Amino acid sequence: ALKRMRDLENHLNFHIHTQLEMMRKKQIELIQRYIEVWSNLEIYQSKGKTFTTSEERIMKKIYELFEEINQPNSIKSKVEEISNQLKLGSMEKEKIKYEISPEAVEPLYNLLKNMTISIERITNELEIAVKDAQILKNELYQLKKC
Amino acid sequence: QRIMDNSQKLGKLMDVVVKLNSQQNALNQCIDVVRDQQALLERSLNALDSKIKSSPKDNETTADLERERIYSLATKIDDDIIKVENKLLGVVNKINQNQVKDDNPKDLNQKVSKILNDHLNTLQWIDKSTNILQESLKVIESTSLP
Amino acid sequence: LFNYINIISDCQDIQILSCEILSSLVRILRVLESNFSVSTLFNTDEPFILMIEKFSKKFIINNNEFDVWSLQLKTNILRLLVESSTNQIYFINRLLNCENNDSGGDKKNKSFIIKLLLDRNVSINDNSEFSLALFQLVNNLYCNSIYYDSFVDQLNNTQDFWNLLLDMQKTINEEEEQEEESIINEELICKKLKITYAIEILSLSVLLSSDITTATTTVGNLVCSTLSNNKWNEIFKNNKSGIVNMINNYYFQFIDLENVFP
Amino acid sequence: MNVKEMDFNDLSNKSNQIINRISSFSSPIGLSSFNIERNLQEIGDTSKQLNDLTSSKTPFSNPLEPNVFQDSKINRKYGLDPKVLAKNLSNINTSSFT
Amino acid sequence: MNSFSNYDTKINEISIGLDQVASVMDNLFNNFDIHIQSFKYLEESLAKPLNSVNEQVHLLSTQFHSPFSQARPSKEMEIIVDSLVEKIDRIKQTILCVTPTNKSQSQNLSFQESFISTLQSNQIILRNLAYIVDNLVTELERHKKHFLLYKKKYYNQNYNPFLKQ
């Protein structure tokens, strides 16, 4: 029994996880191409026409969100600083190490353990609360539509 | 008695091995459904693309040139976002390795620091999820009923 | 200034002046490290950091461009490195590609200061500045804790660094029968400085040679076989008085000032 | 005695399983489900920032209004007995470390 | 009588074996269901693009010129640009969680005092968030009951969408 559970533990932790990351990547490969085909759709359905004030208001927003990514002080630039701070060891701070007294190990174990058991409950209830709230928000939106 | 106690314990665990076989069949069906939804979105994108890329380029206008220029800028934004996400994930996954470099499954400093970091990132998620719940409350409360 | 150093293959005064401007900026910053954070000033900018990576990949790898550069450019690039190797640890970490976070091509990179000690197209007499500044840069990196084992293992395993020391020990003993009167003083000070840094370095490499307490079955094979059991034994078995000569000549004859200055 | 061996393996296994569940309800795509391993000063700084922030999201009543029924609900619900918590904390002083 | 043997070692060893089979089994449900939720989010994430691409594939198959021309840009292009904003602000909020903060006031404390202050602060945050969650869940539990009473009054709907799995 102990062996068969370790056989299935290794199936979840390696085989199923390798299928999950491959499906996560194919989701990105389909989302980038959902945008490819919808930009190409909107050009095709707008072709041979003037703009609208809403096409201007959204084309301005497409330019605003291009520049914040591409300017000298951009999101790209600031990720490239951190890429280089990390390469340099600007974030590998020195690892001081201690004897925690054998008098304090039982107090510390039970303090951290009571925090884990409290966090466990708060996460169990808040996970449900966000689900019940979005279910109520979905139901109310269709009730405001009949 | 102690052999009969351990025998009932093994039996009641084997009755729950039948439930682990249930979770494996549920997990298998999620892996079937996500695969064949991805292979269906793929197939409908190819069935939309093929309609756009069979129209004439005859009578494009100056508005259609600026429009093809800006709706392709939106496609460039998603691909540049994904380059930044992969590079910043390539920073986080190194910072995590850098703190874990001293891996010693007999230390206490490594384990106490990780249990407190797992607590910290969980408490940051609990705050973020209370904000998402409270802002969802406002949108329930402003969704007045007839 | 690094564009002017990398691109201007031609008006070499501009490459020299750029190294001197950088050296004076480094000198000003080192007097103001109570206020200016020099690491952040070299963290932000990947155009600049790809320029240090262009300059390092040019200088570290390509000896064929190095012997197109004049000794005056080579010396003032070494002066910039001697200045920044005092306090500006992060700038040097980049300029050497000392950064880490089977395929072994990487071991070519961190070897370049050990090329500069051993690439005998260049001499260690024929200019005092270049050769003194190289021994100062090597001394600074050997005295700095963050570079220590990562530089000192590469020096210890390089048999020809120990051959350089066993050649400069001839330069002393083969000059000391041949030159009387005029000029000598400033090169004699530069020779005594090169020797002083080499003896500090020797003291530290001899300290580290033994504290790997676990390696009981392998150290006694390595130390007996990389160095030939001829070469190191022949010094101390021919010159059986060798430490008594080292004390009475190479220490005390250098110290006895009332002979050296009247 | 029997010791119930106070293993920080099983405590780390369960702090990490809470995160591995959280990162299945955060999006499994993009910068949504990552976590950062911080060192102990950064854990203290981020803890202070989250303490100073969350204390201004709790409408704590005037300290002369310590609502005994909410106190009795919340600390039983989540397990936050201050008499157990403060007793465990009071054995963790500076002379508990070398 | 003098050929009797003890066996309590073996009966302890089997108990401890069955305690390890239980611990591995509890972890096996957590690892099963973490994967099941991770694949549910991929099914739910596909469902929107899957629908909207499939409607434009159909409109462009009846050859139907809608006389009310679809408004320009289309509402899924509005949503695509806001989907770029939400990724952009996820990157901003990641940068601000990875950049090393300028030297905190905690450089005026020892490792020992800052560790005790971290245990105190985590215990205070845990109390603060426990109150915020207990309040927000109590009030979500008002709104859910108003909604069920509204559906039960005007629509006679005794169905409840908050029935758990």
Curated annotation (Swiss-Prot), chain A:
Location of this chain's protein in the cell: Nucleus, Nuclear pore complex
Domain of life: Eukaryota
Function, in words: Probable component of the nuclear pore complex, a complex required for the trafficking across the nuclear membrane.
Domain comment as written in the entry: Contains FG repeats.
Family under the similarity heading: Belongs to the NUP54 family.
Protein name: Nuclear pore complex protein nup54
Provenance organism: Dictyostelium discoideum
Gene for this chain: nup54
First and last residues shown, out of full length: 295 to 440 of 440
